[PDB]
Symmetry: D2
Subunit: 238 residues, 4 copies
Amino acid sequence: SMFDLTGRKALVTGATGGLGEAIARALHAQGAIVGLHGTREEKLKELAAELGERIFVFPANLSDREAVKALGQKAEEEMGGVDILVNNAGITRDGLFVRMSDEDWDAVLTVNLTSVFNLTRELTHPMMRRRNGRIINITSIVGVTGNPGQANYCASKAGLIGFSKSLAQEIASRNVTVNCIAPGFIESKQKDAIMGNIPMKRMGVGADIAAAVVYLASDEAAYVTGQTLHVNGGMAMI
Amino acid sequence: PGSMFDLTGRKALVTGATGGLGEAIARALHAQGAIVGLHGTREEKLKELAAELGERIFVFPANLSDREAVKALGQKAEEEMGGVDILVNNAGITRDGLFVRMSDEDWDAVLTVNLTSVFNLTRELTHPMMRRRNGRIINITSIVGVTGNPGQANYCASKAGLIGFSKSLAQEIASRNVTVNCIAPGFIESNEKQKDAIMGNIPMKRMGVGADIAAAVVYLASDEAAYVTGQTLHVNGGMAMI
Amino acid sequence: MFDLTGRKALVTGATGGLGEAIARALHAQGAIVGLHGTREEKLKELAAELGERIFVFPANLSDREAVKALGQKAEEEMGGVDILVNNAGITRDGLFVRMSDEDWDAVLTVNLTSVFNLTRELTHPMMRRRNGRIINITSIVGVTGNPGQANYCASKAGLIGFSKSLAQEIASRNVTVNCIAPGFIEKDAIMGNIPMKRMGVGADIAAAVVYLASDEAAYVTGQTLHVNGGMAMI
Amino acid sequence: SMFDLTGRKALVTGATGGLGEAIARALHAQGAIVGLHGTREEKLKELAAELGERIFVFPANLSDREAVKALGQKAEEEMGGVDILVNNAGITRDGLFVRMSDEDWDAVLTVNLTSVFNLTRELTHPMMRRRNGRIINITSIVGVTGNPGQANYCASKAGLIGFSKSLAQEIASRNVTVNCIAPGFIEKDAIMGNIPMKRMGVGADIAAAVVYLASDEAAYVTGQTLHVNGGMAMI
């Protein structure tokens, strides 16, 4: 069958979150062996139990650089080699830029970009040694449009794309692709305002993003690298 | 049915289905359980591909230069397949050469087939799709529509226009659960100085194959891609990164 | 800086809001400006006003032979066009499902094919002079898409694709080709999507044309300059 | 005259480097009062000497967070309000991603993005108060294209653009614009082969783009990325 991920090992960060969970479900549904990263092992273990077999659980605080490294090493070790890394864990520290503290900036950049750097660095050379890999970075519509109140988040998510393109160029000839998915507004006055800019006039759901992950993760998407797949109900058209 | 990216019973029309990409697209769509309308110009080669795949296939010869034939194509496909769910606008032509040497005919031919024939074919099938509250319009553009490419002023205009067309249309028909998206192939296997030089620009250091494009078509055609519209999916070995 | 003294500029749609503002800025920067339009009276008016360094070139841009005659006329009479501003554009707005062949055809013909032809008239001369500026006024909508404008969007998106291709061809000849994408130029529905919360004026686009036309933008080619109050951010 | 910057106060970071010098010279030629930032005072005083009038000199280590903040406060103070901030100073720590140290990554992200965030934060509220401002960020072609050996640099430069867009959205109604210039290759045959113009950019190519975005005439331009690259990438 097509887009079959049977036997592929996938690590999904922020897997307890709505998107992470959906992504983890789709990969699992496609035969993947899925490592669920989160901060709280209890919640991860529940997801693990609800999904069933072919699941690993890997708690780690992604703001802790040594724990990010240990996470990559542990997932790589216990899964017997990670083939698919889904960098999905992200944080926001929303707020107007002029009120934006160093910590709100630093926290978002550290988790959303630097932790991704480090986790990816743990797994990239292993994937190239195996001459097969998928790095799939969950960015946001907002990394390409901008969004007020999100100078930090936008910088990190845009940075994540730039990071991805560079890495893509570097490791492409070794059969590791690196791509981004840019969710629009996903179910997780204000709503109507956002909805007004969505041609489809519905929120996204985790499964919208999860299917794009499976697509990118698949053997069939081996010729796709350095790309940003916009899954956003037409909210921004690239 | 209900499995991931399943297209069982979905009716797809593929233009330029005898070509490299078109054939791969038709095969992948067919493999995914789709009923496939094979468009081409050489009715023979069409019937021959129809025979290889066997069942769930229609053959639809048409000259896409001929605006009335394009209109007939869409109507015939809409009728005989019992409604088209998936339109893959894949057929395209080139009339390459420097702009300073580029005749009115070279320009007109490329724009009419690559853009206008797409507008017309799409116009035939769009409302039917909207009435069905389900459709996929998948337009095969080119990396070159986004990058530019010397010797292809006409082709680049047509392929860039195709994208702008798709974005406008995606916006109009999104509330009707008809998506419209483009796939931008990079250089797809279809002298050693030329190939060497193109490959030097492809991070992956290999040519694409039809199946690379076909799989992107299956993805966008899928129910799972219901929240994707107005987008351009670059399948190019990293040759341009958007 | 950004001096265009003695540069010959041909501005299509020069009688309209943008075209007029463009012509004015170019003239203000020392350019000799060829004013294209269909309204001969409005052309004479602007010419009489700007005074010196003006040529007037009426042409129906739907008429292909007339487009070529325009390019030839401006090249011959201006003594070599240095700057072509393709600004003239039409809409035939309407939902795609009701969109006639003629509404599509007319928009693509004028917005894309007439640009193709005018540009072809002037390209080899510019290249022969190893100096030129082709500046194409596209639209935000060519990048974003817009409902009601499947034709216009296609033409303006296509205008950009054309420009990139041409830019790569002729860059070594010191002829640059660039697009400017105005946002909304003189509905609170529209301004709701514009961070700046005001409309663009012709002078906003005119200044962008002067920048791209300038010797100082000699290293800028194949690009799209978005002048849209933040309405879309590329 | 058009694109006049007379009486505009500009702060240019990395003003002693290739681009920075060219930018500061173009701003000065257009009548701007230019604050020259750099790491070494000797270099800065040299540039200031030759430019003569309407110059300030602000040395600062941009990798030092408190120096960055002090820089912004000092410039805003001594210049009587900064109208134009040109974030131009950036560093590289190039190398294979598999060999990329935390230090190589951190250093580039801190200088190229975080120091920009802090410098910009120092000057944004003032500009917004005045209802006038230009934040002009020097990114790189490579922030849009990617480039091997620069995972860190490309992340920083792409992130710079995303930052700029978000900020542009936030402060646009206060008529403070924020834009990026993406220089291509500024003054090997492999590189040149991908440049349609078949020449390197010079500092002036970038400075002129800075003058344009800084101008009142570019008041309707925000959240944008102006690519100045001889056609090397066409967006």
